Structure 1
Amino acid sequence: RQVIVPVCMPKIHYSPLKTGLCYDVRMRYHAKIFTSYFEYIDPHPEDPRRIYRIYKILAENGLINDPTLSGVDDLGDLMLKIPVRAATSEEILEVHTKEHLEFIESTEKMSREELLKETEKGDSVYFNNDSYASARLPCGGAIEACKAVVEGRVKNSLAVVRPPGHHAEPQAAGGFCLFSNVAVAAKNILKNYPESVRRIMILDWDIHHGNGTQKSFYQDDQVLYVSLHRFEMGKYYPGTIQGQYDQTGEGKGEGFNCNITWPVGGVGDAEYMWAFEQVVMPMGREFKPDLVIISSGFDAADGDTIGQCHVTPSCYGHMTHMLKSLARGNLCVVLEGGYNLDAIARSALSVAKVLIGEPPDELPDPLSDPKPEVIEMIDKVIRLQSKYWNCFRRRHANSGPINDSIISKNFPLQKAIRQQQQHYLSDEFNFVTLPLVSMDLPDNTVLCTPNISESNTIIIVVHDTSDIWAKRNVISGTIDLSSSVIIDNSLDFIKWGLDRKYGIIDVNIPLTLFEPDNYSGMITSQEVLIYLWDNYIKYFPSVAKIAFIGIGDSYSGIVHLLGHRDTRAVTKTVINFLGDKQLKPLVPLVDETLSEWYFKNSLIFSNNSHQCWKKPRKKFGRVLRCDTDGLNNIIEERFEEATDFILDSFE
């Protein structure tokens, strides 16, 4: 009976409101002028058709209550209409100069052919007679949506808006933009609300560089400018040094600019997930913005012919969710790019559903294992930003030139490994160190199975010194040496062959220290190969079915032994685990049918990210492209196919 708590209204602020929407049929008349028949077979870089295609896709899912796709005010229950009005010249002059406003003013009163020269002249832009009012509406719509969000009229806004604004520079336009839409709205809100809107965090995922938006706030600390794109400086538009990742601000805006450059195209979901997991969230929480502005561009979607990427619309919702978690709930979305209307339609659909409140779905591929170039690219970005921000120091061992004379005093470590190696080999497998007299080499250069002069099948396994995995400490800089292992790679084969009663021969060739490519190793390899073949192999009475095994380099020795001798009668298979190295072309001198026997009896495994395939000759001899990287990975992977090819080649 006792009324303990009288009933009260629920006390929440996010989602009793609706999602802001800005849409006009008045921004579809800024169009190009017909020049040549080639325009009929090109993707039409910035076309007015982008608006109504997406707007059609919306009403098909019941989120918008409009059965005939026309501008109304009763937008349903999940979204709220935000009216647009032509922005006065003052808001535009907040970023731009006075001559660019008069440029667009004069543009309004041009004839046809002068507009044609204007389209032809611009840095990838096009003008039109209806390009003044249709350029004033974007900036105004952006300011209205951002006011609606900041003053809490809507929980969040989304604005389908054209022409773009992320390439327009304060001086003049260039890059299919007329007025810089992001910068105008950001400066007008920081001027209109410098008590609530005090720190803004702008993010760019459009695949070009937001050069104008960069310059607008390159000396601003209230505006954290973040841009991700492909750089490819020589060719890829804009091709400016402002797109390079070292543009980290200047003056008071130092550390408050960030360019993220993709070394190559073709990225997917895992890259974006990995990156957004690592970098944007610490500097975002440390920067603590009062508003996060989003400069959306769907010119890199799956099904786009200009971006050539494979990003799915689920990752878009994930990143939308992350940015919604970043800020206090205030969020604004302006659209900049896009070329393939169906990809931009499905992506905008996913983003709008997440903006109404739906959770992001699970990604179609959680396992792609991102390309190596982007990794060290982000490492260099982390170096700069660790120098600038604190959330990257002490956690990545950054904390914000060895010698050249102590090189005479160095620890050898080839012979130590090979000696330890020799030790644990002889103590379990009783390998015979075979002596190469009249050649100055380490005693443990080669080790063979005992009674080698009677075994028919002799497997000759050549390889360099082994690989080392070491643990680097993360607390401070350098690597921990006592916590390292030797990655013995050629061990599975030695055991395998001893399980099948074969002549097994170990061959180590050390590495030329402080040397890019082990050329002297290749020379010494040809010497050991030729010498061993002449002085020892031809004097063993019982011998048949020789198979070679090459790891990484040293295959020049085998190539030289094949080209400069005739030894294919007793050997029946060559196999090299190239990995990543350059190709050893066979130079046949005895005869040419040896080269075809070579190409035929061969299996070579080279990496996915190798120099090729981005088609080899038969002088390389039936190479194959792996799916994984690393010598250890591909050897443990294809250890069975290799023994299969060997056993299939023999009886």
Structure 2
Amino acid sequence: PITGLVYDQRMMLHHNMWDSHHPELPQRISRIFSRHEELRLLSRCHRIPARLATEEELALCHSSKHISIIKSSEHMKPRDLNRLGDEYNSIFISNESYTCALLAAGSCFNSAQAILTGQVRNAVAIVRPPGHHAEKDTACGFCFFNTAALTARYAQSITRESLRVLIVDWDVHHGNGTQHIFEEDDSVLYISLHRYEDGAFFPNSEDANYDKVGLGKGRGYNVNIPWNGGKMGDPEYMAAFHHLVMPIAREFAPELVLVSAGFDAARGDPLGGFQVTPEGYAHLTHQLMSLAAGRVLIILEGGYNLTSISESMSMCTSMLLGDSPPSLDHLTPLKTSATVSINNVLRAHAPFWSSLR
């Protein structure tokens, strides 16, 4: 079994010209790549080339209006770039941003193609800018185009329209964009674990609560696991996987798993406030590898402590390469509100998934 890896230093060119210390840094991807070199993981992977996504591929999930506006930013002067960025919720834009977003998406398409053709068993995509907050018609939360959503549709386009794709989103923030893109769809199961705080945590919407289960034929196919009032870590995430993620995933029987792999729930993150360890992320990855005959693509989303994300994503790659899971620290009893969250999701999803009964 071969593991794929995609990384292209051109994705570093997207930058914040007014605030060069903004946490969505160019060096997020070079640091993760460097740590893979350090641990001698890079030579163990098959290197998959990056490419630009096409406008036609972007149209799988995004409106032409949205594509056109972001495309136009490539030739704007700094004042217009500042003005445009400020129209969105939490976005900065440079002349290279559009191209970088295209590269992120096209990198993941090549990776999914490699997985689905059998060239690799699984893969990791060290990409930026991130995707999961991007909506059909707007940019949001450092995201321009919804890389993971686009990848699911790209995968369906080269196999069959009803290919069952599981998206597990373990970034500490709710993937608002991914939820909305697939909300009426039963071919793409969306499972998000996120810090919620009764709607007080970015992106600040009650769309992230456990009662949002999908619409129309997508009823039951949107699973939100919202955390409230607690510094959640390995015990809570392992419990969520045991009680919710894995039973639902096995019943869905995905043919491809995409991980919206933010590392901002990691111990040390400046924004997330959580304490998931690298060993934690390794165990989550290892569990997901039991699905879809091991066809797993890990896509970088958020995560802002450069040391933490580097160690955490490298450990995921180590798992995809078939290395033995590292030992977790003794798992303490769950924070009381985490039990409450898990039970709430169980109640909301019991009608749709017989494995939860």
Q: TM-score, normalised to structure 1's length? A: 0.54
Deviations 1:29-80 (A, max 9, x none): 1101226xxx65xxx231111111122112222233xxxxxxxxxxx3x210
Greater Cα offset, 160-169 or 303-312: 303-312
Q: Secondary structure at the match of 1:370?
A: coil
Matched with 1:213 is 178
Shift of 1:129: 1.0
Q: Is the 8 A contact 2:267 2:276 kept in 1?
A: yes
Q: Secondary structure at the match of 1:229?
A: strand
Q: Does 1:286 align with 2:264?
A: no
Matched with 2:132 is 166
Q: Secondary structure at the match of 1:164?
A: coil
Q: What is the alpha-carbon distance in structure 1 between the residues aligned to residue 198 and residue 233 of structure 2?
A: 22
Q: Is the 8 A contact 2:198 2:228 kept in 1?
A: no
> May I ask how many residue pairs the two structures share in their alignment?
357
Matched with 2:351 is 387
Within a 5 Å distance, the mapping from 1:530-541 to structure 2 comes to none
Matched with 2:13 is 29
Shift of 1:232: 1.9
Q: Is the 8 A contact 1:159 1:335 kept in 2?
A: yes
Within a 5 Å distance, the mapping from 1:137-176 to structure 2 comes to 137-176=103-142
Q: Secondary structure at the match of 2:4?
A: strand
Q: Is the 8 A contact 1:21 1:80 kept in 2?
A: yes
Within a 5 Å distance, the mapping from 1:224-243 to structure 2 comes to 224-243=189-208
- Which amino acid is 1:33 matched to? M
Q: Secondary structure at the match of 1:305?
A: coil
Shift of 1:120: 2.7
Within a 5 Å distance, the mapping from 1:304-323 to structure 2 comes to 304-323=269-288
Q: What is the alpha-carbon distance in structure 2 between the residues aligned to residue 132 and residue 376 of structure 1?
A: 42
Shift of 1:139: 1.0
Matched with 2:231 is 266
Deviations 1:183-229 (A, max 9, x none): 1111121122118x711111011111100000010000011100010
Within a 5 Å distance, the mapping from 1:493-512 to structure 2 comes to none
Q: Say which structure is richer in helix.
A: 2
Matched with 1:131 is 97
Q: What is the alpha-carbon distance in structure 1 between the residues aligned to residue 283 and residue 97 of structure 2?
A: 36
Q: What is the alpha-carbon distance in structure 2 between the residues aligned to residue 254 and residue 208 of structure 1?
A: 22
Q: Secondary structure at the match of 1:32?
A: coil
Q: What is the alpha-carbon distance in structure 1 between the residues aligned to residue 7 and residue 336 of structure 2?
A: 42
Q: Secondary structure at the match of 1:114?
A: helix
Q: What is the alpha-carbon distance in structure 2 between the residues aligned to residue 135 and residue 251 of structure 1?
A: 31
Deviations 1:287-332 (A, max 9, x none): 1111111110001111122112122111211111110012211111
Q: Does 1:50 align with 2:28?
A: yes
Q: Is the 8 A contact 1:265 1:307 kept in 2?
A: no
Q: Is the 8 A contact 1:86 1:136 kept in 2?
A: yes
Q: What is the alpha-carbon distance in structure 2 between the residues aligned to residue 234 and residue 166 of structure 1?
A: 18
Deviations 1:357-411 (A, max 9, x none): 1010110223x11111121222121111111221222xxxxxxxxxxxxxxxxxx
Q: Identify if the C-alpha distance between structure 1 residues 357 and 29 changes in structure 2 by more than 3 Å, giving closer, same or farther.
A: same
Matched with 1:91 is 57
Matched with 1:327 is 292
Q: Is the 8 A contact 1:269 1:365 kept in 2?
A: no
Within a 5 Å distance, the mapping from 1:532-551 to structure 2 comes to none
Deviations 1:322-360 (A, max 9, x none): 100122111111000011100111111211111111010
Q: What is the alpha-carbon distance in structure 2 between the residues aligned to residue 331 and residue 323 of structure 1?
A: 7
- Which amino acid is 2:245 matched to? V
Q: What is the alpha-carbon distance in structure 2 between the residues aligned to residue 260 and residue 63 of structure 1?
A: 32
The answer for unaligned runs of 5 or more in structure 2 is none
- Which amino acid is 1:62 matched to? R
Q: Secondary structure at the match of 1:387?
A: coil
Q: What is the alpha-carbon distance in structure 2 between the residues aligned to residue 266 and residue 225 of structure 1?
A: 24
Q: For the aligned residues, what is the CA RMSD?
A: 1.4
Q: Is the 8 A contact 2:199 2:208 kept in 1?
A: no
Shift of 1:235: 2.9
Q: Secondary structure at the match of 1:364?
A: coil
Q: Is the 8 A contact 1:312 1:364 kept in 2?
A: no
Q: Does 1:252 align with 2:217?
A: yes
Deviations 1:155-186 (A, max 9, x none): 11111000000000001111110111011111
Q: TM-score, normalised to structure 2's length? A: 0.97
Shift of 1:236: 1.1
Deviations 1:411-462 (A, max 9, x none): xxxxxxxxxxxxxxxxxxxxxxxxxxxxxxxxxxxxxxxxxxxxxxxxxxxx
Matched with 1:120 is 86
- Aligned-residue sequence identity (percent) comes to 43
Q: Does 1:301 align with 2:237?
A: no
Shift of 1:233: 4.1
Shift of 1:264: 2.1
**Bigger relative contact order (CA 8 A; separation at least 6):** 2
Q: Is the 8 A contact 2:85 2:93 kept in 1?
A: yes
Shift of 1:241: 2.1
Q: Secondary structure at the match of 2:10?
A: coil
Q: Identify if the C-alpha distance between structure 1 residues 314 and 234 changes in structure 2 by more than 3 Å, giving closer, same or farther.
A: closer
Shift of 1:109: 2.0
Deviations 1:258-289 (A, max 9, x none): 11100124112211122211111221111111
Q: What is the alpha-carbon distance in structure 1 between the residues aligned to residue 33 and residue 64 of structure 2?
A: 35
Q: Pick one of 355, 376, 393 that aligns with 2:320.
A: 355
Q: Is the 8 A contact 2:91 2:140 kept in 1?
A: yes
The answer for unaligned runs of 5 or more in structure 1 is 1-14, 65-75, 394-651
Q: What is the alpha-carbon distance in structure 2 between the residues aligned to residue 354 and residue 389 of structure 1?
A: 28
Q: What is the alpha-carbon distance in structure 2 between the residues aligned to residue 159 and residue 146 of structure 1?
A: 10
Q: What is the alpha-carbon distance in structure 2 between the residues aligned to residue 369 and residue 280 of structure 1?
A: 19
Q: Secondary structure at the match of 2:46?
A: strand
Shift of 1:234: 4.6
Q: Secondary structure at the match of 1:50?
A: helix
Greater Cα offset, 246-255 or 301-310: 301-310
Q: Is the 8 A contact 1:198 1:290 kept in 2?
A: yes
Greater Cα offset, 246-255 or 25-34: 25-34
- Which amino acid is 1:219 matched to? E
Q: Secondary structure at the match of 2:97?
A: coil
Q: Secondary structure at the match of 2:110?
A: helix
Q: Say which structure is richer in strand.
A: 1
